[PDB]
Amino acid sequence: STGVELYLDLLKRTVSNFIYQDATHVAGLITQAAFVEEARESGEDYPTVAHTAIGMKRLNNLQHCVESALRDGVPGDVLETGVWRGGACIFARGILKAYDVRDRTVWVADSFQGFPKITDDDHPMDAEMNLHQYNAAVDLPTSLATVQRNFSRYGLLDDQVRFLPGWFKDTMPTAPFERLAVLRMDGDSYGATMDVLTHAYPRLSPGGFAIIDDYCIPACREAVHEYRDRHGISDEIVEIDRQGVYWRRS
Amino acid sequence: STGVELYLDLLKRTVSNFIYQDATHVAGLITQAAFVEEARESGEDYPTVAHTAIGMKRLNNLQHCVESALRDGVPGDVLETGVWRGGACIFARGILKAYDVRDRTVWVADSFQGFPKITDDDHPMDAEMNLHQYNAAVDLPTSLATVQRNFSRYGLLDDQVRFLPGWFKDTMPTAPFERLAVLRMDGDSYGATMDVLTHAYPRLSPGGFAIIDDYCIPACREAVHEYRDRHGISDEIVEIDRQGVYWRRS
Ligand SMILES: Nc1ncnc2c1ncn2[C@@H]1O[C@H](CSCC[C@H](N)C(=O)O)[C@@H](O)[C@H]1O
Ligand SMILES: Nc1ncnc2c1ncn2[C@@H]1O[C@H](CSCC[C@H](N)C(=O)O)[C@@H](O)[C@H]1O
Ligand SMILES: [Mg+2]
Ligand SMILES: [Mg+2]
């Protein structure tokens, strides 16, 4: 292992807290608080302390996508839509740091207040789930100041990290990036997924990667297929674990 | 920063848990449980979760000693006597890993049971302190299995980590190492300090480093000066923080 490989390996173990192995919140299918290795490996629990919930397999995928973009010269920035405590974006900034990339930015997009209240404008699948009801139960609302604090703890808060605070329907249409190499979608709902596919995906470079964290959620999957059908996109959907998928844009 | 620099910086922040900032035990001079940056920076608190209590200044010192030994070709292994949860030894193994050193071992020596019960044979200053009284209060007893588990969480449990379980009086005289480049002493008491100086210091290479973690403790300091006087050692004692010192062997 090289210095770069050791750093990024440790960074994944740290943002997912394989190091200290924090308890999970009890919610959904998780009925016990105990840390379970298999659950954290595949991002299936609700960490009380860890900076990301996506798990090792999805962290490895993020690494693969960013490294492939760098290797193949795919132009553009990295955007995550739905960041919680910021761990996946911290890792993305770390990847760029490890390779001394100074001309790409990590865009950190969130409401910074959890899921929105449902209204009559919402998709029926989103309204039925009503993910807003779980905001407190899994400690979802996390302020911009707290996320910035978290970046600083790893020594990774700098001018190649830019924040996009607000609802995706407000922030995405005129977000000030020109091109993306990796677009990581992690907002759970039909609405959040469709917001970002509509308004950010057209800026994803050929050869860039589109990651859908929440493909196991029917509402998210619905938006993915509606959007792909609308635009005639047939790029192979590849599974990462039991929840997430990605495709590479041809 | 290079990959090695990034890895070692993160490893120090992780073993001391500047990342998640765990509470301290309320013991000694510490009257509040809250994480205090300045206390963790100088290793002055009693972490509830972190893998080392030595703090950032003493971690930096250990890095300096190991890197200097490597740079100057000082032969030998690294030994820590008194390891608690193993974080300082984990860091030492990480330094060797970062520089792809394959021919040096980190020796991890502890009772794995905390401080010993005081007997009539103990030095009077050790009987007066009775450090055994504090074992449970700061969660000191940490089994060999737990320490091995901790190494494995960082991906650093391999055949270049060797364990010496037992009281130093019993393990040091015939410990199987031949030469040391760094001898890190962290047992607090006159007895632990004298046992290790007596039985391990003669194997410290010229140009090697002797670190005394607990030099602020009068009983420890007495052993240090008694030993140095007996052996005619006049190498400069260099202060690290409010607790620790080191010298480099002529
Ligand atoms: N319509 C919307 N606009 C902006 N943010 C939203 C949103 N719907 C949900 N979110 C945010 O989406 C996130 C879902 S959880 C994200 C997990 C994170 N990627 C990790 O690494 O663990 C939450 O932070 C929530 O506040
Ligand atoms: N005589 C003796 N023999 C063996 N181990 C001893 C000892 N006296 C104390 N110890 C051990 O010395 C350690 C003191 S605390 C060590 C702190 C550790 N270096 C860190 O990085 O935080 C304890 O783990 C205790 O079990
Ligand atoms: Mg998700
Ligand atoms: Mg000590």
8 A C-beta contact, residue A220 and residue A154: no
- Residue in A147, A184, A141, A139 with CA at minimum distance from that of residue A46: A139
Query: Does ligand 2 come within 6 angstroms of the Cβ of B196?
Result: no
Q: Beta-carbon neighbour count of residue B56 at 10 Å?
A: 18
- Encode burial over A180-204: b for 16+ CB neighbours within 10 A, e otherwise: bbbbbbbbbbbbbbbbbbbbbbebb
8 A C-beta contact, residue B247 and residue B236: yes
Put simply, the answer to whether A13 touches B155 (Cβ < 8 Å) is yes
Tell me which residue has its CA closest to atom 26 in ligand 2: B114
**With an 8 Å Cβ cutoff, is B102 touching chain A?**
no
Min distance B52 CA to chain A CA atoms (Å):
12
A50 SS3 class: coil
What contacts A168, CB < 8 A, 6 or more positions away?
Answer: A81, A109, A187, A192, A195, A196, A199
Distance CA A187, CA A196 (A): 9
The CA-based diameter of chain B, rounded to the nearest angstrom, is 54
- Residue in B53, B33, B55 with CA at minimum distance from that of residue B42: B55
Distance CA A175, CA A203 (A): 11
| Domain ranges within chain B, ordered by starting residue | 1-250
Tell which atom from ligand 2 comes closest to the C-alpha of B86.
Answer: 21
Min distance A43 CA to chain B CA atoms (Å):
17
Among all chains, which residue has been given the structure tokens 């394989």? Answer: A18
To the nearest 10 degrees (0 to 180), the angle between helices A218-231 and A190-199 is 30
Put simply, the answer to whether B153 touches A21 (Cβ < 8 Å) is yes
Min distance B186 CA to chain A CA atoms (Å):
23
- Encode burial over B205-224: b for 16+ CB neighbours within 10 A, e otherwise: bebbbbbbbbbebebbbbbb
Among B5, B14, B97, select the one facing A14 at the smallest CB separation. B14
Distance CA A212, CA A246 (A): 6
Cross-strand bridge partners of residue A81:
A109, A185
Q: Beta-carbon neighbour count of residue B140 at 10 Å?
A: 20
In chain A, which residue ranges form alpha helices assigned H by DSSP? 3-15, 37-41, 55-72, 87-98, 124-129, 144-153, 168-171, 190-199, 218-231
Distance CA A3, CA A98 (A): 9
- Token pair belonging to A160: 């190649």
Distance CA A172, CA A81 (A): 9
What contacts A175, CB < 8 A, 6 or more positions away?
Answer: A79, A107, A109, A164, A199, A200
Query: Does ligand 2 come within 6 angstroms of the Cβ of B17?
Result: no
**With an 8 Å Cβ cutoff, is A237 touching chain B?**
no
- Encode burial over B65-80: b for 16+ CB neighbours within 10 A, e otherwise: bbebbeeeebebbbbb
> Which positions in chain B touch A21 (Cβ < 8 Å)?
153
DSSP string, A191-225: HHHHHHHHHTGGGEEEEEEEEETTTTSHHHHHHHH
**With an 8 Å Cβ cutoff, is A159 touching chain B?**
no
To the nearest 10 degrees (0 to 180), the angle between helices B55-72 and B3-15 is 140
**With an 8 Å Cβ cutoff, is A184 touching chain B?**
no
8 A C-beta contact, residue A44 and residue A115: no
Distance CA B126, CA B118 (A): 8
Handedness of CA A167, A172, A174, A176 (dihedral sign): positive
What contacts A62, CB < 8 A, 6 or more positions away?
Answer: A54, A88, A91, A92, A95, A182, A184, A211
> Which positions in chain B touch A37 (Cβ < 8 Å)?
none
Q: How far is CA A42 from CA A46, A65, A240, B43, in A?
A: 12, 18, 9, 35
**With an 8 Å Cβ cutoff, is B13 touching chain A?**
yes
- Token pair belonging to A177: 């990036």
8 A C-beta contact, residue A108 and residue A175: no
Pocket test for ligand 1, best of A11, A186, A193, A213 (most atoms within 8 A of CB): A186
Distance CA A17, CA A24 (A): 11
DSSP string, B41-87: HTT-S-BSS-S-SSHHHHHHHHHHHHHHHHHHT---EEEEE--TTSH
DSSP H/E element including A108: strand A106-110
DSSP H/E element including B206: strand B204-212
Q: What is the amino acid identity at position B122? A: D
Q: Provide the resolution (angstroms).
A: 1.4
DSSP string, B134-197: GTTTTT----HHHHHHHHHHTT--STTEEEEES-HHHHSTT-S---EEEEEE---SHHHHHHHH
> Which positions in chain A touch B9 (Cβ < 8 Å)?
155
Put simply, the answer to whether B14 touches A19 (Cβ < 8 Å) is yes
What contacts B34, CB < 8 A, 6 or more positions away?
Answer: B23, B24
CA A59 and chain centroid, separation: 10
User: Around ion ligand 4, which residues have CB less than 5 A away?
Assistant: B 186, 213-214
Distance CA A23, CA A232 (A): 43
Query: Does ligand 1 come within 6 angstroms of the Cβ of A86?
Result: no
Å from CA of A51 to ligand 3 middle: 13
What contacts B38, CB < 8 A, 6 or more positions away?
Answer: B44
**With an 8 Å Cβ cutoff, is A134 touching chain B?**
no
Distance CA A86, CA A150 (A): 7
Distance CA A62, CA A59 (A): 5
DSSP H/E element including A164: strand A161-165
